[PDB]
Design a protein around this nucleic acid. Structure first.
Lengths: 105, 93, 97, 95, 83, 78, 103, 95
DNA sequence: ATCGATGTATATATCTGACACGTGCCTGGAGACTAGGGAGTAATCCCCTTGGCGGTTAAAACGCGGGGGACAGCGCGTACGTGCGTTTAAGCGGTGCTAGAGCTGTCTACGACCAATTGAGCGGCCTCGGCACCGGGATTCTGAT
DNA sequence: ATCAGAATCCCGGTGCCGAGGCCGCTCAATTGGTCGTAGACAGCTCTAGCACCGCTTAAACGCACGTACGCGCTGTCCCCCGCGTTTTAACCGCCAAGGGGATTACTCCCTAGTCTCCAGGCACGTGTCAGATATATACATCGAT
């Protein structure tokens, strides 16, 4: 295997991540395994978000993940929602949630 | 004549997870910004961890404890598992 | 005239404006408001159209996330109507000015 | 009170003076004048087809423009305002 | 061409709609003025930093990256506008 | 052992906060809130510590943990 | 020195060493540590001046953390700068809600 | 017998400037110390973000100035910018 | 409670702009060497944490009675919602101008780097004051009288 | 009002310890001097921002009316508060053990830097299908009747 990404079994670019860690001035040096690890973590997080979003899309019987579906995936999952609590998502809308007192009797 | 992004890598991950679900353009912009956000967060935390210890290099140890500091519980555990798995494989053979 | 009992149209409008996602503040007046606010900082600025749209997205997100907390405060006081004391309590708890 | 450096303000004059464009409020701006001067010099020396005359990059204001002819000649062009009026009050006990 | 008093572009039904999205079932009549004040304060606090990032870049055009950077600074990260 | 945060101590914290009259269930709720906050902060402190390959949570670790929560704390050699 | 050259009291040399060995950028303009040392000294003079006065009100000739908290929280634009900062042994601003006062 | 850095004597000198008779207790010393560290880390972090945002490799006084204008609130910002400009200008005035 | 009809949700047919895909170039990723400095590891010092204890005393815990504040119910008036008709100005398209973003070459000032050196700063040490406090006196609170 | 019983505030002598001042030394800041390059300046190009007009038409406005709901008022009760008494465990000072932090010396291997390929990725361009809407249809449901 030539490229470090395929050598690490990932899909995110280990090389691009290595460059961004170098010309980002986070430290004088960047260990060999740091880009591998960081790209693996990025890949896992984006795989989780895309999985949940795809499910949210399959719910509404659509085929394309629009931003609405990313918002539903993020908000409707406690751990992502804690990771992305201070994050507006353009066109995201809001979770459909009427307060329990406002509904008529 | 180039512009960097993750617009194709996120698409590969998608096709690997949901083999038949496309992703819109604005949603691709969102994911492309989410990856950048998490990258800057984990990298900034690893930089803080490099200075707080008077180290100089961002090893994998630094990225690991940075992932433990940022992501909440089960995301942290799974992300650390994936990271160590990818690192170990890279070290192997 | 035929009429639903008050509250019903408000309920269906809540349903409808929580399903959809289109921007709610009318666009052109918001562009004008942004330019008018920016004049006090650097005269003759030009606003990338997408920058104005980003400001509008952020502002609608903030007002929606403020009316959520306002509604929480109002219901906490055994009311259904939100009122300026609710908004001021929400913004005082959040930490804003 | 430096006795040598002055601000220049145009007095009343009926026939419009073509240096109006270079005003910054009531002061004649050295910067804008220099800018127009150098732009004119550059565009004119680009009309020199069979001789490489090069305008040297900005360094100050007193050596307004420095031109290089071929590979041996250098010419310093300094722009100066002329006043027919009395020598400034401060500069009397000299000469 | 100066503009003045466009805070009344955030009309009454626009704020009513924003509320209805927020879940509000019944809005008092003095919410409109307080909401316009709140919106103007927030917009000033964001556009000041947008314009500052601009001026520091020596540009004369507020890019969307400047607005996104301003929001990220205020602590309200925005996703979906490059960078 | 959370009960070490006695009823009068929560009362004193509320006094300092300006609370005039305290209900009876505020005590259990406040013990819960405090335990949550301490869980988060000590988790981050122990993370920084483990990463430094030490075994004594030092003041700088807790200062950093609080800074990371967004509650910067002046006064401990920051 | 180099802090005396700028009429500062904060050490421009130390702020240079910290901007350089802190990995904030590859290069550090030689006019940056001066500007930064000046801004730090101005904010420290502001804090210490408001603090001092409060101590003098408490008829005391020695600032203690309580006085720093009183200065930082009474001033409106120092509060906004340190809005998310707790000061050790700082106490709070004497403030009883007007509804709780007797009637 | 190492050399741990801290802004003790500096904050002390600024104090003796602004209150020639008021001392400062070791705990308030530590607080002023952590305040200097916090503000300096904020300003340098924002200067770094400015530099990287505009693809520059130097933190010049321009970046520190915009960092101050971003962090410190309004009046504090204006007065701090003035103080820094004055200090830097004075530094240029020497050699 | 049926209408009913308003509204919501379900089903199919059509259009079209957005996307998923197939190339061509290029530049950034990858690989092989070299070198040196950062990090690991072992040894040693000594500080600083932990534990144990005995006593004292301030604080916690407990009982109790009573009053004052929480909470529910009712009434009343206003003020907010809803529907219609009229007015306004957003949105869209289309054109047209151009101010300014963006890329590129040149060149000079400026900052990194290194070696010498010299004073500023840190640490140990010690003397004085400043704060806490105790006590006595005086004024001002809260509450029954 | 008043009178009292504390609570608080003022003023002064007093002790303790911690802060402020001094001195010695080592190490980092300063100063030249050299070199490389970042960035500034200008100049060209063309994208994109602004301005404006005219139409259509959806939304905003204004107004009228009714009723739901906010709010004040009253009544009851339970549940905090405040106080006095008994208990308990925190503080403190002291001492001992020893674990681990911090430092130093040595060595090695891991990463930066550089140069040399070359394929992964991006912009371009294109074909098509997912989704929005139209039209038609089945059913929930709000509600005054």
């Amino acid at each position: 295997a030539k490229t470090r990404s395929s050598r690490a079994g990932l899909q995110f670019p280990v090389g691009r991540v290595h460059r961004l860690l170098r010309k980002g001035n986070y430290s004088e040096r960047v260990g060999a395994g740091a880009p591998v690890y960081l790209a693996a973590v990025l890949e896992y997080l984006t795989a989780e978000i895309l999985e949940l979003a795809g499910n949210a899309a399959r719910d509404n019987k659509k085929t394309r993940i629009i931003p609405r579906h990313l918002q539903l995936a993020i908000r409707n999952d406690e751990e992502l929602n804690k990771l992305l609590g201070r994050v507006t998502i353009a066109q995201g809308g809001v979770l459909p949630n009427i307060q329990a007192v406002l509904l008529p009797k | 004549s180039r512009k960097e992004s993750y617009s194709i890598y996120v698409y590969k991950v998608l096709k690997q997870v949901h083999p038949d679900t496309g992703i819109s353009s604005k949603a691709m912009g969102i994911m492309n910004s989410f990856v950048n956000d998490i990258f800057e967060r984990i990298a900034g935390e690893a930089s803080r961890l490099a200075h707080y210890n008077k180290r100089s290099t961002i090893t994998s140890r630094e990225i690991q404890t940075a992932v433990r500091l940022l992501l909440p519980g089960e995301l942290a555990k799974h992300a650390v598992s994936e990271g160590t798995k990818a690192v170990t494989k890279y070290t192997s053979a | 005239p035929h009429r639903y009992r008050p509250g019903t149209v408000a309920l269906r409008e809540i349903r409808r404006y929580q399903k959809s996602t289109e921007l709610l503040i009318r666009k052109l007046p918001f562009q004008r408001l942004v330019r008018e606010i920016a004049q006090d900082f650097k005269t003759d600025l030009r606003f990338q159209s997408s920058a104005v749209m980003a400001l509008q997205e952020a502002c609608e997100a903030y007002l929606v996330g403020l009316f959520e907390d306002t509604n929480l405060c109002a219901i906490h006081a055994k009311r259904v109507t939100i009122m300026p004391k609710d908004i001021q309590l929400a913004r005082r708890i959040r930490g804003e000015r | 009170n430096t006795r040598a450096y002055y601000f220049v303000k145009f007095k009343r004059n009926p026939k419009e003076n073509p240096l109006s464009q270079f005003l910054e409020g009531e002061i004649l701006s050295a910067s804008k004048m220099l800018s127009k001067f150098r732009k004119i010099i550059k565009e004119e020396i680009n009309d020199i087809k069979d001789t490489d005359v090069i305008m040297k990059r900005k360094r100050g204001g007193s050596p307004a423009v420095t031109l290089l002819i071929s590979e041996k000649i250098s010419v310093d062009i300094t722009l100066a305002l002329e006043s027919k009026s009395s020598w400034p009050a401060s500069t009397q006990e000299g000469l | 061409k100066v503009l003045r008093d466009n805070i009344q572009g955030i009309t009454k039904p626009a704020i009513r709609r924003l509320a209805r999205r927020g879940g509000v079932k019944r809005i008092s009549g003095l919410i409109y003025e307080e909401t316009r004040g709140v919106l103007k304060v927030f917009l000033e606090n964001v556009i000041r930093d947008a314009v500052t990032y601009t001026e520091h870049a020596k540009r004369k055009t507020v890019t969307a990256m400047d607005v996104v950077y301003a929001l990220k600074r205020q602590g309200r990260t925005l996703y979906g506008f490059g960078g």
